Scaffold this active site. Structure first.
Site, PDB file in Angstrom:
ATOM      1  N   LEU A 179       0.570  -1.301   0.027  1.00 42.09           N
ATOM      2  CA  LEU A 179      -0.070  -0.124   0.159  1.00 42.09           C
ATOM      3  C   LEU A 179       1.052   1.494  -0.084  1.00 42.09           C
ATOM      4  CD1 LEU A 179      -2.886  -0.580   2.706  1.00 42.09           C
ATOM      5  CD2 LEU A 179      -3.105  -0.842  -0.436  1.00 42.09           C
TER       6      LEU A 179
ATOM      7  N   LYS B 287       4.291   3.121   1.655  1.00 41.65           N
ATOM      8  CA  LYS B 287       5.595   2.995   3.152  1.00 41.65           C
ATOM      9  C   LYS B 287       5.641   4.906   3.533  1.00 41.65           C
ATOM     10  CE  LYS B 287       8.968   1.004   5.289  1.00 41.65           C
ATOM     11  NZ  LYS B 287      10.603   1.060   5.001  1.00 41.65           N
ATOM     12  N   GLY B 288       4.611   4.666   4.876  1.00 34.58           N
ATOM     13  CA  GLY B 288       4.387   5.475   6.257  1.00 34.58           C
ATOM     14  C   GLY B 288       5.412   5.672   6.848  1.00 34.58           C
TER      15      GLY B 288
ATOM     16  N   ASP C 115       2.294  13.317  16.088  1.00 34.35           N
ATOM     17  CA  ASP C 115       2.763  12.913  14.922  1.00 34.35           C
ATOM     18  C   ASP C 115       1.354  13.763  13.961  1.00 34.35           C
ATOM     19  OD1 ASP C 115       5.786  12.658  15.676  1.00 34.35           O
ATOM     20  OD2 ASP C 115       5.356  10.956  15.664  1.00 34.35           O
TER      21      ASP C 115
ATOM     22  N   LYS D 100      -0.739  15.249  11.231  1.00 35.01           N
ATOM     23  CA  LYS D 100      -0.203  15.657   9.803  1.00 35.01           C
ATOM     24  C   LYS D 100      -0.957  15.139   8.434  1.00 35.01           C
ATOM     25  CE  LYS D 100       3.926  13.072   8.785  1.00 35.01           C
ATOM     26  NZ  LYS D 100       3.202  12.388   9.893  1.00 35.01           N
TER      27      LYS D 100
ATOM     28  N   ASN E 195      -0.960  11.537   8.114  1.00 32.96           N
ATOM     29  CA  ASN E 195      -2.139  11.172   9.052  1.00 32.96           C
ATOM     30  C   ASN E 195      -3.498  10.402   8.171  1.00 32.96           C
ATOM     31  OD1 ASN E 195       0.329   9.807   9.760  1.00 32.96           O
ATOM     32  ND2 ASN E 195       0.818  11.359  11.116  1.00 32.96           N
TER      33      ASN E 195
ATOM     34  N   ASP F  75      -2.030   5.898  13.289  1.00 32.55           N
ATOM     35  CA  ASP F  75      -1.432   6.137  13.656  1.00 32.55           C
ATOM     36  C   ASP F  75      -1.281   6.489  14.984  1.00 32.55           C
ATOM     37  OD1 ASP F  75       0.299   4.628  11.354  1.00 32.55           O
ATOM     38  OD2 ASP F  75       1.840   6.010  11.194  1.00 32.55           O
TER      39      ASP F  75
ATOM     40  N   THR G 143       7.715  17.201   7.935  1.00 36.59           N
ATOM     41  CA  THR G 143       7.226  16.827   9.523  1.00 36.59           C
ATOM     42  C   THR G 143       7.023  18.634  10.068  1.00 36.59           C
ATOM     43  OG1 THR G 143       9.425  16.636  10.297  1.00 36.59           O
ATOM     44  CG2 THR G 143       8.036  14.421   9.404  1.00 36.59           C
TER      45      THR G 143
ATOM     46  N   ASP H 141       1.724  23.730 -15.508  1.00 37.16           N
ATOM     47  CA  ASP H 141       1.305  24.310 -16.707  1.00 37.16           C
ATOM     48  C   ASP H 141       2.003  23.784 -17.655  1.00 37.16           C
ATOM     49  OD1 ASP H 141       3.185  26.030 -14.513  1.00 37.16           O
ATOM     50  OD2 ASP H 141       3.411  27.415 -17.002  1.00 37.16           O
TER      51      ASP H 141
ATOM     52  N   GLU I 227      12.509  27.508  -8.842  1.00 37.12           N
ATOM     53  CA  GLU I 227      12.362  25.987  -8.022  1.00 37.12           C
ATOM     54  C   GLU I 227      13.260  24.675  -7.602  1.00 37.12           C
ATOM     55  OE1 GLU I 227       9.977  25.471 -11.654  1.00 37.12           O
ATOM     56  OE2 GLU I 227       8.056  25.625 -10.811  1.00 37.12           O
TER      57      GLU I 227
END
Length: 465
Positions: free
Chosen positions: A15, A17-18, A132, A134, A137, A153, A172, A411, A420
């Site tokens: 699925l 990698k968190g 944590d 964010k 999550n 989590d 983070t 664009d 950038e």
């Protein structure tokens, strides 16, 4: 009689990698039930607590139910690993959905935040802190516009060390409460993180921003922020009042997740029947896209470089295992030996590899034997096998990065500017002088921009290849 993970579940596909490790879509071997399993290393990722405290927390998590919290179902442990078996969602991360929206209003934002605050309120009642919190999550049940949000989590922070590689800690810094940096924190830190998410939902921009991780953390630790940006003209004063209370510096004065739910902004804007205006926050969506595109390209770049390292080992190593198997030294091998040899290479792909690697061999080999021997002779030159096996691995790597590069280039210019690049590399924590040196090497007559192939050449150089 201690239960074994593989006795019960088989992996279907990865699925993603968190934080803390990989998430694998798994299937109960009896009942068919699909689950998401977070596989965490005892080594690679390690531990803050003792085992007792972890087992206790696990036991508590299995008894809690809320419609905005990811259900944990089971926990297993073998010698190398812990397995956290939970509910599966397929709707994707919240922001990835929001950026596809054509329209987005204060009510859309309030409904999203009410779910988050309802989840948080319930966990805090049970003395469980996320820490944590964010956007990554926050997962949706569905790519529907109205979809329920499930926070993943909760509770993990307390027990496992966060991976200090930059891929795993991009994003983070924007969300972390200042008191967590300093070490004395409690459940109010989740309110702060949520305040940060809300701010972003309403303006498309972090309240605490910067060129790199430490510039961001500096800003957080001072805790000053404004509503100076012009698009805050388009936001209600009530939304700003809530934000001020969730981003109160001193935690004892910060509003609780319970009281944040009661704030008039939440109670007003989350009516079932909309009694208020919904001007689209068109500027905020534009900023959110940029923000998300930037973050995803920076992650993609780091994963591309990470993948390019971990697999340099392979070509030589695979050739060795194959040579050593070639007792007779004729440069050839059959299908059974090539399968075995490729398992050997995943057996040792680090002490730690992806769980579905031993299983993916057979069909991944057949996919190579098709390109090298489409008439199925069955005595195959393993150097050509290696050559095509790894050619395919490299191409697939190139494609995930290309995809992210294309999304960033909204664009359709085909190119990204040096400024950038400066932003992307700042996020990725690649030294400024170092990437410019690389750019000048790749293309001397670069004139402040790079196409995809030149961007990818830079990355190769930034990891020694």
């Amino acid at each position: 009689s201690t239960a074994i993970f593989s006795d019960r579940y088989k992996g279907q596909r990865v699925l993603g990698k968190g934080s803390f490790g990989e998430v694998i879509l798994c299937k109960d071997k009896i009942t068919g039930q699909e689950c998401a399993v977070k596989v965490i290393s005892k080594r690679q990722v390690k531990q803050k607590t003792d085992k007792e405290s972890l087992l206790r927390e696990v036991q508590l998590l299995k008894q809690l139910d809320h419609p905005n919290i990811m259900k944990l179902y089971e926990f297993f442990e073998d010698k190398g690993y812990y397995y956290l078996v939970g509910e599966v969602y397929t709707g994707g991360e919240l922001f990835d959905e929001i950026i596809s929206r054509k329209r987005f209003s204060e009510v859309d934002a309030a409904r999203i935040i009410r779910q988050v605050l309802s989840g948080i309120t319930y966990m805090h009642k049970n003395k469980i802190v996320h820490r944590d919190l964010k956007p990554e999550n926050l997962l949706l049940e569905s790519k529907s516009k109205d979809a329920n949000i499930r926070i993943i989590d909760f509770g993990l922070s307390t027990h496992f060390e966060a991976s200090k590689k930059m891929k795993d800690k991009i994003g983070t810094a924007y969300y972390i409460a200042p008191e967590v940096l300093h070490g004395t924190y409690d459940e109010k830190c989740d309110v702060w993180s949520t305040g940060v998410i809300l701010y972003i939902l309403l303006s498309g921009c972090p309240p605490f921003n910067g060129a790199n991780e430490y510039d961001i953390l500096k800003k957080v630790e001072k805790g000053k922020y404004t509503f100076e940006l012009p698009q805050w003209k388009k936001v209600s004063e009530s939304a700003k009042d809530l934000i001020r209370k969730m981003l109160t510096y001193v935690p004892s004065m910060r509003i609780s997740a319970r009281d944040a739910l009661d704030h008039e902004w939440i109670q007003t804007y989350t009516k079932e029947q909309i009694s208020v205006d919904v001007p689209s926050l068109d500027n905020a969506i534009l900023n959110i896209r940029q923000f998300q595109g930037t973050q995803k390209l920076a992650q993609a770049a780091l994963l591309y470089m990470g993948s390019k390292l971990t697999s340099q080992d392979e070509t030589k190593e695979l050739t060795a295992i194959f040579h050593k198997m070639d007792k007779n030294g004729d440069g050839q091998l059959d299908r059974a030996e090539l399968i075995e040899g490729y398992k050997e290479l995943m057996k040792m792909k680090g002490q730690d590899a992806s769980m579905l690697d031993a299983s993916a061999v057979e069909h991944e080999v057949d996919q190579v034997l098709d390109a090298v021997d489409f008439d199925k002779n069955g005595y195959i030159e393993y150097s050509e096998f290696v050559t095509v096996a790894m050619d395919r691995k490299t191409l697939l790597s190139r494609e995930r990065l290309e995809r992210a590069f294309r999304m960033f280039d909204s664009d359709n210019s085909g190119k990204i500017s040096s400024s950038e690049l400066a932003t992307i590399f700042g996020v990725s924590d690649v030294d400024s002088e170092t990437w410019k040196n690389v750019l000048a090497e790749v293309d001397k007559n670069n004139d402040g921009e790079v196409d995809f192939d030149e961007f990818q050449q830079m990355l190769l150089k930034l990891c020694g290849n």
